[PDB]
Amino acid sequence: TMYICGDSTECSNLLLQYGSFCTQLNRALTGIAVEQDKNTQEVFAQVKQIYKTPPIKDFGGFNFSQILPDPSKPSKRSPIEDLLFNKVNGLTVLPPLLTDEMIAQYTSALLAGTICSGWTFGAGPALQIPFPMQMAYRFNGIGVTQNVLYENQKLIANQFNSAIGKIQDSLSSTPSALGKLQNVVNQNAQALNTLVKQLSSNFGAISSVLNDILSRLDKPEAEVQIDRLITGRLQSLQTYVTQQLIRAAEIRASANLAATKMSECVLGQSKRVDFCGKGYHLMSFPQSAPHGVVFLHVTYVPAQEKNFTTAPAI
Amino acid sequence: QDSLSSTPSALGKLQNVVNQNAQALNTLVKQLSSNFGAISSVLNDILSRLDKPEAEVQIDRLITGRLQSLQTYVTQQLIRAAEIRASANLAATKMSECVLGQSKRVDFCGKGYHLMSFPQSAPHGVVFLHVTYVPAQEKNFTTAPAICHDGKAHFPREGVFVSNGTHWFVTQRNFYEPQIITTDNTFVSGNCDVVIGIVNNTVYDPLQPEL
Amino acid sequence: FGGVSVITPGTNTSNQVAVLYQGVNCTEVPNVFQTRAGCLIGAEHVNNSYECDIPIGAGICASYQQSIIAYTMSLGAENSVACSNNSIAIPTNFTISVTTEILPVSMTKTSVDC
Numbered sequence A: 001t002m003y004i005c006g007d008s009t010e011c012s013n014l015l016l017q018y019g020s021f022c023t024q025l026n027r028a029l030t031g032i033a034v035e036q037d038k039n040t041q042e043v044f045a046q047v048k049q050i051y052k053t054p055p056i057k058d059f060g061g062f063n064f065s066q067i068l069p070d071p072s073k074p075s076k077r078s079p080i081e082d083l084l085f086n087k088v089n090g091l092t093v094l095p096p097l098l099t100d101e102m103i104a105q106y107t108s109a110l111l112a113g114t115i116c117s118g119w120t121f122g123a124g125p126a127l128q129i130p131f132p133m134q135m136a137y138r139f140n141g142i143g144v145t146q147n148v149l150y151e152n153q154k155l156i157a158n159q160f161n162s163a164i165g166k167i168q169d170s171l172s173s174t175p176s177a178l179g180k181l182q183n184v185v186n187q188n189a190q191a192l193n194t195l196v197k198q199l200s201s202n203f204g205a206i207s208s209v210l211n212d213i214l215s216r217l218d219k220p221e222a223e224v225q226i227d228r229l230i231t232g233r234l235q236s237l238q239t240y241v242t243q244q245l246i247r248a249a250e251i252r253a254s255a256n257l258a259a260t261k262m263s264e265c266v267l268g269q270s271k272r273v274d275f276c277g278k279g280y281h282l283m284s285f286p287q288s289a290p291h292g293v294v295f296l297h298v299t300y301v302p303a304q305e306k307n308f309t310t311a312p313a314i
Numbered sequence B: 001q002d003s004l005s006s007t008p009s010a011l012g013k014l015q016n017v018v019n020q021n022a023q024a025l026n027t028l029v030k031q032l033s034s035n036f037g038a039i040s041s042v043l044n045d046i047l048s049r050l051d052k053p054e055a056e057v058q059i060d061r062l063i064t065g066r067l068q069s070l071q072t073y074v075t076q077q078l079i080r081a082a083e084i085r086a087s088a089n090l091a092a093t094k095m096s097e098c099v100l101g102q103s104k105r106v107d108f109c110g111k112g113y114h115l116m117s118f119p120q121s122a123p124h125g126v127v128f129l130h131v132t133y134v135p136a137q138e139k140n141f142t143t144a145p146a147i148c149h150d151g152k153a154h155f156p157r158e159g160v161f162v163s164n165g166t167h168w169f170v171t172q173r174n175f176y177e178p179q180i181i182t183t184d185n186t187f188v189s190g191n192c193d194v195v196i197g198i199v200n201n202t203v204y205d206p207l208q209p210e211l
Numbered sequence C: 001f002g003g004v005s006v007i008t009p010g011t012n013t014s015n016q017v018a019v020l021y022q023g024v025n026c027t028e029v030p031n032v033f034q035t036r037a038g039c040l041i042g043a044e045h046v047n048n049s050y051e052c053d054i055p056i057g058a059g060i061c062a063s064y065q066q067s068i069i070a071y072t073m074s075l076g077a078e079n080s081v082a083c084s085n086n087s088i089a090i091p092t093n094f095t096i097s098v099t100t101e102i103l104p105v106s107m108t109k110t111s112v113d114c
């Protein structure tokens, strides 16, 4: 009503002739808004208990300082998360049910669980295990014997620590790294700007401004001009809502995929090819981002092959 | 059975579909009461009062409004239909992977380690009963990555090495069932100079007392 | 200007309500609590955290406890994992759990003759 008529009572009374169109539009946008909170909950609220890491970070040479919360900052976000966050008329914007801090707390709980109890906390009570032994189990999961992990523990820890460092440097120097999240922000801003600019259109009326019509014309003449504006503005609003419903469906599908990855990549070890990164999946770590989630996938990739003669049997 | 019979919100997901569709039809029908700028919402009242040229002006207003109302309905149905299709595709996947087999996908077939599932029919939908295995009553044990014996490093073939404070055993991981460490449940790889945290213990060879 | 929302428990429980004035200061309105969502009147703000019942926004939820209260929502029970470098926890027992999952499959098939 306010978008179409502003505070004009003459317009409002004419708008009533169209029935419940405005009720339908308000309802559709409400449904979308509610869904956005559902999407977030499905992805991040997958842990019953809120876990915290120990004061003593002894993980057998494995360094998680870039993904764990940095206590020296008021936001209590990881170094990587800080980087991610710094890289991205009747109209109002509603706040999310969960704040950025609450989402960060969920992420921290998931990381603390994974690091100290592996995948056990995702299928019941958290069972503690030494990190090196957790990694040994994950090596078995990809068909590699556990002695390979233990014999090369220093090498493996170093390769891991180096790879994580590269992620931080890559993001900080790659303007297009977070294009997927930026595209969502840009599309929504563009849609609202279009909707507002449509209020400048005459749609065949003498003026786009209701106050200018009402101050010049008497009732019967004003009504003719107002009807033209109502028709155009109602059509503009219907166009906006339809596009939002279509975009909302796309985002929902993305959120459903993210929720699946949280369960199958973070809360367990996946055997699905290319589902949790390229190579043989070992484990994954979640990081929060503006209107989205970032997964860091750790995989095992074979190197330096040699040619041998083989036989099916001896 | 007792939960469903005492929980009004248990089947909200199916009820929501019914409610949304009923609401959409009620809205579509109520739009027939709108004038859309015409002298009347009733075509018979227009035709009984006005001659052809005058009636046509009034009728055109009703056609425009009613056509717009119908287009709105259909568009919303296409969008809702796509959502239901996605749900049906997921249900079909679960039927195959949860009911017709045992899944290794975490949280795909219930919380815990999936054992099996059973389908039940419902109004406009399907209900799955997921049976899972959930670990309980854990205990703290001391562990080691390997056992050193005769200068060799022994690793578990299937389980994990644990100690009750005085003796070392090997056990399956998801259920405490301690067994004597033997050459039949470990394998040897290299010496004891490499593995960090390796501990000293006897490894029993079943052939020893026989020979 | 702004929207007005009514926060209520079911009429099957109580006839008490709280009113949220969206996007406005509590000073412009004429148990008054200012939130990021707007001014909430009729709900008593408490320092206790509970599971979210009726969502308000920005971490704030309301519930009926008798009168209506407002609080910061809890994300779940706090717990510390027994994280160590030489100790493992192993289940000595188990339980068999049965849970229900409900999915929509189809809609009512309607037809409208244009």
Ligand SMILES: *[C@@H]1O[C@H](CO)[C@@H](O)[C@H](O)[C@H]1NC(C)=O
Residues within 6 Å of the ligand: A063, A064, A065
């Ligand atoms: C962990 O990594 C950070 C960043 O490279 C480094 O400053 C810190 O000293 C490392 N911690 C240990 C124990 O090496």
Ligand SMILES: *[C@@H]1O[C@H](CO)[C@@H](O)[C@H](O)[C@H]1NC(C)=O
Residues within 6 Å of the ligand: A305, A306, A307
């Ligand atoms: C194995 O032999 C092939 C010959 O087709 C050669 O291309 C390849 O480089 C060889 N692998 C190694 C390790 O030399």
Ligand SMILES: *[C@@H]1O[C@H](CO)[C@@H](O)[C@H](O)[C@H]1NC(C)=O
Residues within 6 Å of the ligand: B138, B139, B140, C081, C082, C083
């Ligand atoms: C194991 O030790 C930890 C110490 O952090 C304790 O919290 C936990 O209750 C212990 N497990 C058992 C079975 O007592």
Ligand SMILES: *[C@@H]1O[C@H](CO)[C@@H](O)[C@H](O)[C@H]1NC(C)=O
Residues within 6 Å of the ligand: B164, B165, B166, B167
């Ligand atoms: C560990 O198990 C062995 C074999 O049953 C038993 O003899 C020993 O007393 C146990 N140690 C403790 C501390 O219970």
Ligand SMILES: *[C@@H]1O[C@H](CO)[C@@H](O)[C@H](O)[C@H]1NC(C)=O
Residues within 6 Å of the ligand: A058, A060, B196, B197, C085, C086
């Ligand atoms: C476990 O931590 C202790 C220090 O608390 C250290 O002395 C010991 O060598 C560590 N063991 C392993 C296998 O890292």
Ligand SMILES: *[C@@H]1O[C@H](CO)[C@@H](O)[C@H](O)[C@H]1NC(C)=O
Residues within 6 Å of the ligand: B148, B198, B199, B200
């Ligand atoms: C294991 O035995 C060797 C000698 O065979 C000894 O040098 C080493 O220190 C012992 N380690 C432990 C933990 O007893």
Ligand SMILES: *[C@@H]1O[C@H](CO)[C@@H](O)[C@H](O)[C@H]1NC(C)=O
Residues within 6 Å of the ligand: B008, C010, C012
């Ligand atoms: C309504 O109140 C009655 C008790 O008077 C209760 O048995 C029933 O379950 C309630 N219904 C709902 C939806 O809360």
Ligand SMILES: *[C@@H]1O[C@H](CO)[C@@H](O)[C@H](O)[C@H]1NC(C)=O
Residues within 6 Å of the ligand: C025, C026, C027, C034
């Ligand atoms: C309006 O609310 C804000 C936030 O609480 C406060 O800082 C500001 O002073 C209030 N304005 C008035 C006039 O009280």
Ligand SMILES: *[C@@H]1O[C@H](CO)[C@@H](O)[C@H](O)[C@H]1NC(C)=O
Residues within 6 Å of the ligand: C045, C046, C047
């Ligand atoms: C909440 O805590 C603040 C102190 O931070 C106190 O001033 C206020 O009165 C408390 N309110 C309630 C309901 O406990």
Ligand SMILES: *[C@@H]1O[C@H](CO)[C@@H](O)[C@H](O)[C@H]1NC(C)=O
Residues within 6 Å of the ligand: C092, C093, C094, C095
């Ligand atoms: C395992 O738990 C069940 C109850 O869920 C109990 O009846 C049974 O005795 C327990 N087994 C042991 C060894 O404690």
